[PDB]
Structure formats: C-alpha cells, structure tokens
Design a protein around this ligand. Structure first.
Ligand SMILES: [Fe+2]
Ligand SMILES: [Fe+2]
Ligand SMILES: [Fe+2]
Ligand SMILES: [Fe+2]
Lengths: 453, 452
C-alpha cells in the first residue's frame, strides 16, 4: 500500500488556486450596480485576490477587513454551486453563464480551496467560544428591550431606506430557505433524520409553491419596491450577512459539524418567534399597511429538544454535547457581528452629507502634515465602476476634476464634483462610478481620519 | 485581472491525486468479507490504483473491466461524503473513522478528482446515446414476457441465494432513498422546485417507520440480511454502483438538471412494473416470511410529465428537450448493463462446482503449451484478498494448503492441494487462506476455451 500524502494547500499555491477559481469570467466586475436577473454572476473582484495573505487567519477584531469580505464572497459562490438556480425569465439567453457556473471545472476549483477559505472565515471562532453530561446540558439549555436592528432602522434619518437595506441582506438566505438545512437529511441514519425532515417539510410548505417560505419572502420584497431575483443586490451584501448565511452551508456541507447544526437548530427555532415578531412590528411601523409580512407571521403560527437532541445524546453519547453547545455559541457570536456591522453601515449611509462636508477639514490637516498619509492619483473614464468593497483604514477621496457617483449603500449616493470629496470610513461597504468623460481624483490613506482634524 | 488558467488534471498528476484520496486508512483492505456496522470504511484497494490509466476512457465494451469497477468504488465514496451516516449501534467508538470520512481533506481530495472520475465512468455514454419540438418530444414520450432479473433468479440453481445477492445491490440506493433526487430541490427556482419536493416527500414519509428506507430494512431483515451500510460492499456489483452513481452524477452537477428530469419520468413510470415483478419474484422464492411492503407501497409518473416537464420547457425553451431525452436514454443503457452484469454474476456463482471440475482440463491444456503467463504466490493464513475482477480469464491452481475462493454472497469454494477453479473475466471474486500457508499459481489463460 503506497503511503498517504496529507492534503496540503498553502502559500503561493493557495493564492494561485484562489485566483484560478475566481478568474472565471462570471465572477468579474459588473458594469452596473445590480445583477439583471442572472443568478450565475457573482462579483468577487478577482483583480485583488493575488495581493492577499490567506495563510494569516484573522481574529474577531479584523473579520470586517476587506480580505474577510473577499473570502465571504468566494465562500458564498463556492457553496451555492450545489444549489439549483434559474432566472425568473428563464434560462433562454443565459445558457453560457449557466454552463460556466455549473461545470466540472468550477466546482472542483472551489472545493479544492474551500478548506482554506473555511479557515479564514471561521478560524476566529476558536478563540470566541470540556466534558458534559445530559444534566449540565439541560440547565444550559434552560438559561436561554429594543434590538440593535430596531434602533438603527427606527433611529435612521431615512427609515424606509434603512429597512430596505435590511431586507436585501436576507435574500441569499430566505429565497433559498432551508437549503442549508436539507444538507443534513441526506443519507441514512436514525429516527432523527425523519424528525429533521419534518422541519424541512414545513420549511418547503408541504410541496405547495404558494405556502413555500421562499415565495412568502418574495411578496415581502415585492411589497416595498424590491425585486426577488438572485443575486440582484450582491454588491449591497454586508460582510456579516454572507458570514451568517455561509455558516449554515459550513455546518451543512461538513457533516463532522452535524451536532453543531443540531445546537444551532434549537437556538434558531427558540428565538425565531421573537425575531419574526420584531420584524413584523418594525416593517409595519416603517412602511405601514402596504408591507406584506406574512412570511414572518407564518413562523409565529408554527419538538427539537425531545425529538432530536434527546435521542441523539442517548444513541451517540455525551461526547457530542460540547459540539451542540459550540454550535449555539458560535451562532450567537455571529449574530452580534451582524448587529454591529449593520448598525455601522446605516450610520455610515445616513452621515453621507456630513462626511462629504467633513472632506474639507480633513483635507486641510493633510496639507499641514497633521498626519503623513500615502496618496494615490487616479484618472478613470466614465463607466469605470469600482465594485463595492471596503478598506482597513479610513481614506480621503478628493475630486480634482470631473463628476463621480460615490455609493455607500442601496439608496445612498453622493455626487462629487471638482474640488469636493468624502471621508470613507474603514470596513464600510462602498463603491464608485465615473459620470463624466474623465475624472481625476486622489485617495489619501489617512488611517484614523480624526488625526487630521 | 489575471488570466484564467483552465482547470487541468491528467497524466501522472491524476494518478497521484487518485492515490492520495484513496490512501486514507478508512479505504484500506478489510480483513473480513463484510463491514461490521461502520458506514465510514469503504474498500477501494488503493495499492492497485497507481497501475491504472485514467486518461484512456473506455467504451461500453470495457466498462465491466476492473478499472471501471475501481472508479465506481471511488465515485461512490466521493458522492456519499455529502450524505449523513451514523452506525446502527451509535457513533460511540467510530469517532475517528467518522472524522476520517467527514473532514476537509477527504472532501477536497475527492472533489478534485471527481471531474476525471466522472469522465472515466460515464464517458462511454457519449457514443451510446439534434433539435426537438414539444410535439416531437410528446410523441417520443408516448411511445415508451419476463424481465431479465426474473429469468436469472428463477433460473438459478439456488433461488434464495440468487435473490439475496439481488437485494444487497440496492442497499446504497434504497437505504438512502431520495438522497440523489434531493440534490435538485436545493436552491431557488420556479414552481418546478415545489413539484420535485412533493416527489421527495412521498419517498420520506416524514415518519421514520413509513419512511421507504425503513421499509427496505424490514425487507432485508426478513431474509436474514442486515441493513447497515456498507456491510456487503465487497459484494456490490460494478453495474450496481454504476446505476447508483449515475443519479448522484445527475444530482451533483446541475448542468445535468434536465437529464434528471428525463430520468425522473422513466423511473417513476417504469417503477410500477419493476415493483410488481419484484413482489412476485420475492414471494415465489421466499414465501410467507419475506416482507415486500417496500415494493407494494410504491405500486409521480403522471405528475412529472405535466407538472415538471411541461412548465420547464415552457420556461427554458426547446433547447432543454435533447437533454431530457439524453437522461432517459442514458438511464436505459445502464439498466441494460445491470441486467447483463447481474445475470452473468449469478451464472458464475451457480457454475462454481463445475468451474472447479473444469480446472483440471484447462490445466492440462496449459501443460501441453496449447496456450500462458504464470504468477507464483505464497500467502499466510488470514490473507483475505478483497473482491475484484480481471479483464481475462484466469486459472487458479493450488499446490498446497487450503483456500476459500469467494464468488459472491453465499457462494464459496474450498480449494485444496491439486485442485483449482476457472475464474471468468469481469466476474466479482475474492479469496482467503484457510491454512497456515498456501502456495498456488495463477495462470492468465485469456480465453480458457482455447485450453480445452
Ligand atoms: Fe422558515
Ligand atoms: Fe475604495
Ligand atoms: Fe419511494
Ligand atoms: Fe484474483
């Protein structure tokens, strides 16, 4: 028997393999802000991946840096190759993009880099979350006010724009609802398999398309002027949103974390009533009667501890309890990241007029060397659309000549003319496009922008 | 934007990558003929994989050669990594085999070689199966004696052994029923998704006792067979794995989604005749004790042409009709291979006493130089050669010792000094040593009839 060479992929061979998967033309930069009914095109900005270090796994203080957002976009596209998508208007015309996403090359390229991507995205959870008995697990299970999402949407200068930015975050999740959960009911195991499929049955709405939860979220999006084609608002997905959705494909694809999904299954269903009640009350508060919230209220109309957790512990032993606990705590940490990330973006979107005015005083500090900041000069023609991204330090955009559309979120835009600019806060999703025949502008890497005031 | 380097894996780098995935100790040779309640260990015989050419894809005339059987075993192991398995007696004790099967290394190594394995396994179908209209398709759909399976089991010298060999072939399929089809209901598309999930619902029952996999459990336990995967892995036929791997092939690769739409029509619309013949066959062989509720419950075909095929062609155009037909015809070719492979295996098992007698005359023909390469072997007690096959007939001649020659589930021969057996090509077979030592020769006679 020949010796086994352990699987290894790191260093430059990892960067080349990640670039290889992402250089597929369906992943290149979009010329518009939205995807036009094409579920096979996902913008991964491949021109930046060669310059990132995937060997250096970041901590929680740095999971909002661009490399983590770049990895989230790669992981979403890698996971979703197992899911069936077709445009709302049909496959006719998009056959070539359909073949470039579902091909023997695309999945193998993404599956070979998945272990390394799955460690840059979730490696920090080891520092954020012993032996257990069924008795200790019970008490921990028994020990489980305005939400941060309510404060940001209700306290926003534009409540409707804030809520619409919140709804599109659930597009990859709710429109393919229970797709990650179904990864566990494949195979052959005990009665817990039928019990888990019982959740999927309700999650798919008995087979009827009208009561399917994915169709319910369509009417929710269509009631506020938003579309339901994936992935229309891909460029408006926050880092934390992809992190939350990718976590269940992470738990669902890798069956060694099957008991971690069992823990997160309890926590979601036991917190789902309060979440759906808050979403229904908040949406009707922002939009009124015109909003369709049947998706959330149906969940209140609708078994895991006795019918799944208990028989699994009796059959597979007490050694699986820490993983059930770890799945609960890992998910709670991720929810905290979403509340912080989403609240920072809304405040960043609402403060756009003042951060544009703030460009002046920051610009004077640099001219007086209050800080020493690297500068880059750029000349781009109209239609050079920088896809949405973020930076690890604050930047000062200064427009010398021309006209630029600075994007900070769905419905949040600034027109920047000659002599004007904007202060770009770090870790915030943002992009830009040129609206004039030519635009000359500068980018100042000031680190902390408050050091220039 | 850096230029795109197209995915490439062939030649020596392909063999190294296949050996790399299969050298996981959970894939090593089993010391017994059966797996004892461990769904994470599958025998892939990795010490033979370096000596196969995966670049030369064989045609249908050679898809029963051993190289195809080796690829079938790997593809099943790669496909089933997406499936949840737990032992019947619990995990407690299989933790490291459980971690050795469900790990990022096992999945990435198997997914990297999957495109090449799928070209070796299904490449012949390109030579075995234009534009279409909805009307041309309807007419093709409207135009679709004992079965070969009945003739083989009822014509067998041991009908009970014949039927038990037939039941274990469906273990990876029936015990994980609707698992390949459920790969298509993940995602986000039109009403056709809800129609497909309704078919999956019937296969799962939602209740565990009425779940169709549980019905097949009581079927196997009623004839003395166990329901833990993969106990009879060494007794799985090439064509059996080929049929099961075909639906994971269609389910994993969503570019073949409409090929599955064709295969969905044919199976459910032919499953009634299949289940009725199986119910009649099992009751004739076993009698009152056999539980055939699995087959009678199945007795989807009409919901699939109107509620799935019709709106899909209306939504995606006529260009998907050729793939729907291809899924139908590709499935019919594989059933033809299963019927031939299974009929040949039973005839090979029933003819064991005569093939032992036939060793004598084949052996003198070699003694007259009428035909053969020879290999001498000295193996100790407990040397269990896992089941495999060869591309030509071989003559096993025993000089000294005792050997248990395995030819199938319940088919065995004791081979002593001076005796032997004629090993027919492409037939699943194995061997074990029953004496403190066994010295024997293996003669590669090609066609054994040239020695008579
Ligand atoms: Fe739901
Ligand atoms: Fe930027
Ligand atoms: Fe069924
Ligand atoms: Fe042999």
């Amino acid at each position: 028997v020949p010796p086994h060479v352990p699987f290894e992929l790191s260093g430059a061979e990892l960067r080349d393999a990640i670039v290889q998967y992402a250089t597929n033309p369906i992943y290149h930069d979009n010329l518009d802000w939205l995807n036009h009914d094409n579920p096979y095109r996902r913008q991964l900005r491949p021109q930046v991946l060669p310059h990132l270090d995937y060997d250096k796994v970041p901590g929680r203080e740095n999971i909002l840096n661009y490399a983590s957002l770049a990895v989230q976009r790669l992981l979403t596209s890698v996971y979703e190759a197992d899911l069936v998508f077709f445009p709302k208007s049909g496959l006719k015309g998009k056959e070539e993009d359909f073949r470039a996403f579902y091909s023997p090359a695309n999945r193998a390229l993404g599956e070979r880099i998945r272990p390394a991507l799955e460690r840059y995205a979730f490696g920090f959870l080891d520092d954020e979350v012993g032996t257990w008995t069924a008795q200790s697990l019970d008490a921990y299970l028994d020990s489980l006010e305005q939400s941060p999402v309510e404060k940001a949407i209700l306290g926003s200068a534009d409540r409707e724009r804030a809520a619409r930015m919140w709804l599109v975050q659930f597009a990859p999740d709710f429109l393919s609802e229970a797709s990650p959960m179904m990864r566990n009911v494949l195979g052959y195991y005990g009665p817990a398999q039928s019990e888990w499929f019982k959740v999927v049955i309700d999650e798919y709405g008995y087979g009827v398309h009208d009561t399917k939860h994915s169709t319910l979220f369509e009417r929710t999006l269509e009631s506020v002027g938003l579309e339901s084609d994936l992935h229309r608002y891909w460029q408006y997905y926050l880092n934390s949103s992809l992190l939350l959705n990718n976590y269940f494909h992470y738990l669902g694809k890798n069956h060694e974390l099957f008991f971690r999904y069992v823990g997160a299954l309890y926590y979601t269903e036991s917190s789902l009533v309060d979440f759906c009640r808050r979403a229904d009350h908040l949406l009707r508060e922002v939009f009124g009667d015109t909003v369709d919230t049947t998706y959330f209220t149906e969940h209140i109309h609708i078994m895991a501890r006795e019918k799944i957790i208990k028989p699994l512990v009796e059959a597979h032993g007490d050694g699986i309890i820490p993983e059930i606990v770890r799945g609960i705590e890992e998910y709670r940490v991720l929810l905290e990241i979403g509340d912080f990330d989403f609240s920072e973006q809304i405040a960043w979107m609402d403060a756009q007029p003042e951060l544009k005015k703030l460009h002046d005083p920051v610009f004077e500090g640099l001219k007086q060397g209050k800080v020493d900041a690297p500068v880059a000069h750029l000349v781009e023609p109209r239609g050079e659309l920088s896809n949405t991204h973020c930076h690890d330090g604050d930047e000062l955009c200064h427009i010398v000549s021309g006209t630029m559309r600075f994007e900070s979120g769905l419905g949040s835009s600034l027109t920047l003319q000659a002599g004007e600019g904007v202060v770009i806060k770090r870790n915030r999703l943002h992009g830009a496009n040129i609206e004039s025949d030519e635009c000359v502008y500068e980018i100042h890497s000031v680190g902390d922008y408050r050091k220039c005031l």
